[PDB]
Amino acid sequence: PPSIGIAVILVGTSDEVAIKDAHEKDDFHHLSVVPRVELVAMNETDPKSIITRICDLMSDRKIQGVVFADDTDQEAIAQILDFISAQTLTPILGIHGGSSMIMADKDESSMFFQFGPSIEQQASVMLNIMEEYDWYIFSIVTTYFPGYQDFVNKIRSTIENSFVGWELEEVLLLDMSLSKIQNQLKKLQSPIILLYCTKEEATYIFEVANSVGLTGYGYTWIVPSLVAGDTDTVPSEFPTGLISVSYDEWDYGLPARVRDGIAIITTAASDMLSEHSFIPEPKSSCYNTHEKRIYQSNMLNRYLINVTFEGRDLSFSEDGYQMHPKLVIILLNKERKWERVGKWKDKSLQMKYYVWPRM
Ligand SMILES: *[C@@H]1O[C@H](CO)[C@@H](O)[C@H](O)[C@H]1NC(C)=O
Ligand SMILES: *[C@H]1O[C@H](CO)[C@@H](O)[C@H](O)[C@H]1NC(C)=O
Ligand SMILES: [Cl-]
Ligand SMILES: [Cl-]
Ligand SMILES: [Cl-]
Ligand SMILES: [Cl-]
Ligand SMILES: [Cl-]
Ligand SMILES: [Cl-]
Ligand SMILES: [Cl-]
Ligand SMILES: [Cl-]
Ligand SMILES: [Cl-]
Ligand SMILES: [Cl-]
Ligand SMILES: [Cl-]
Ligand SMILES: [Cl-]
Ligand SMILES: [Cl-]
Ligand SMILES: [Cl-]
Ligand SMILES: [Cl-]
Ligand SMILES: [Cl-]
Ligand SMILES: [Cl-]
Ligand code: NA
């Protein structure tokens, strides 16, 4: 019978996932392809251990798709996953963690997809939140983290052509390497500040700003889902009164994300088998790649891109982000815990507070 080998790699998760033994030879939601899911749990959590582990695994076993989750703030994992996907022409889904943090510079040949919001979609949500409370005067601070230009250009885009009273005061670009930063942050006027950067960079940028008094009352910082990250890990240096977009497993838990990864890869193999009477072979080397099986791969990609499952639209954009994620807006409260203050689902923002709290 027709069957696709899928690997599920969970990395540093307290969260527990249980999947049918592959030996069951059991169909998955009536799809014509039968998944052979290999669960792999990882004790180790550094990028090097992960490439070593995933590559060893493609060499040793017959894998044609990879579902990957991690519980860390290590965006670097997304770089590794992209490379591997490109090298092997295998679909790789980054369903949670550092693996799903926005990666702007994806190889156009990789079939690496991330769950959650594109960089633009988050820029858009950030402006939605600000309009819902007539926060119209604001500044942007970014680092050099890839995506930063796509961030600003999306703000400037939606702002320049609209008859709302938007006013972009300053736009900063920070160099994280050495304190000539202090002099740049000191130049910040506006009460709303949009910050694009990494969790790591954020925690240092805050500490500096905390000590220029651009934190606290009268200043609101809005930040992208990667800066929140693992919401159980809150840097001492993050200011209470911090708003962030987020996708850190509030309503959509790991087992549901894994179920969904399997469905995407398995629907795609099914739809392709339907039309072309065949399915891409397993590639077995991240490195020594005789891999000019390029025509086949490209074909799969048309299908991964458009999957729909249990009524959910799981389709992906060209840049490799999820088209329609259901996001949560969160707030860093006085007890220094992240708190739900909103929701978003197909251009519909539902905020929780009537008057914005004082934190
Ligand atoms: C993919 O999306 C298009 C356009 O919205 C749709 O019409 C098409 O039938 C989809 N394919 C599947 C298998 O749903
Ligand atoms: C695997 O994880 C740790 C540290 O990475 C290791 O040292 C340890 O021996 C392993 N887990 C257990 C329960 O021993
Ligand atoms: Cl391991
Ligand atoms: Cl981490
Ligand atoms: Cl996520
Ligand atoms: Cl993100
Ligand atoms: Cl984008
Ligand atoms: Cl950029
Ligand atoms: Cl730019
Ligand atoms: Cl700088
Ligand atoms: Cl501090
Ligand atoms: Cl969620
Ligand atoms: Cl579930
Ligand atoms: Cl299921
Ligand atoms: Cl190899
Ligand atoms: Cl082509
Ligand atoms: Cl509180
Ligand atoms: Cl909450
Ligand atoms: Cl709400
Ligand atoms: Na994401």
Helices (H), the chain: 47-60, 76-88, 119-131, 148-160, 181-185, 199-210, 225-228, 254-276, 294-304
Structure tokens at 8: 């599920």
Q: Give, using CA atoms, the residue closest to atom 5 of ligand 2.
A: 44
Residues 18 and 126 in one domain: no
Whether ligand 1 lies within 6 angstroms of the CB of 315 is answered as no
> Are 111 and 129 in contact, with CB atoms under 8 Å apart?
no
CA of 340 to the centre of ligand 18 (A): 4
All residues at 6 or more sequence positions from 177 whose CB lies less than 8 Å from its CB, including other chains: none
CB atoms within 10 A of CB 248: 20
- How far apart CA 249 and CA 299 sit, in angstroms, is 32
Containing domain of residue 7, as a range?
1-116+247-325
Do residues 188 and 121 share a domain? yes
Experiment used for this model: X-ray
Looking up residue 101, the CATH number of its domain turns out to be 3.40.50.2300
DSSP 8-state class, residue 282:
P
Both 2 and 101 in a single domain?
Answer: yes
Residues 111 and 194 reside in one and the same domain: no
Total domains, the chain: 2
Q: Which residues are within 8 A (CB) of 307 and not within 5 positions of it... i.e. 6 or more apart?
A: 263, 264, 267, 268, 314, 315
Q: Which residues lie closer than 8 Å to 81 by C-beta, 6 or more apart? A: 66, 68, 92, 94, 99, 112
**Main-chain phi, psi angles of 262, to 5 degrees:** -60, -35
Q: Indicate whether 337 and 349 sit together in one domain.
A: yes
Q: Are 68 and 112 in contact (CB under 8 A)?
A: no
From the CA atom positions of the chain, what is the Rg in Å? Answer: 21
Relative to beta strand 66-70, strand 5-11 is parallel
Nearest CA to ligand 1 atom 3: 306
Query: Under DSSP, is residue 216 helix (H, G, I), strand (E, B) or coil?
Result: coil
List residues forming the annotated binding site for Zn(2+): 96, 249
Structure resolution in Å? 2.8
Long-range contacts of 38-45 (CB under 8 A, 24+ apart): 38/5, 38/6, 38/7, 38/8, 38/63, 39/8, 39/10, 40/7, 40/8, 40/9, 40/10, 41/10, 41/11, 41/13, 42/9, 42/10, 42/11, 42/12, 44/11, 45/11, 45/12, 45/70, 45/72, 45/74
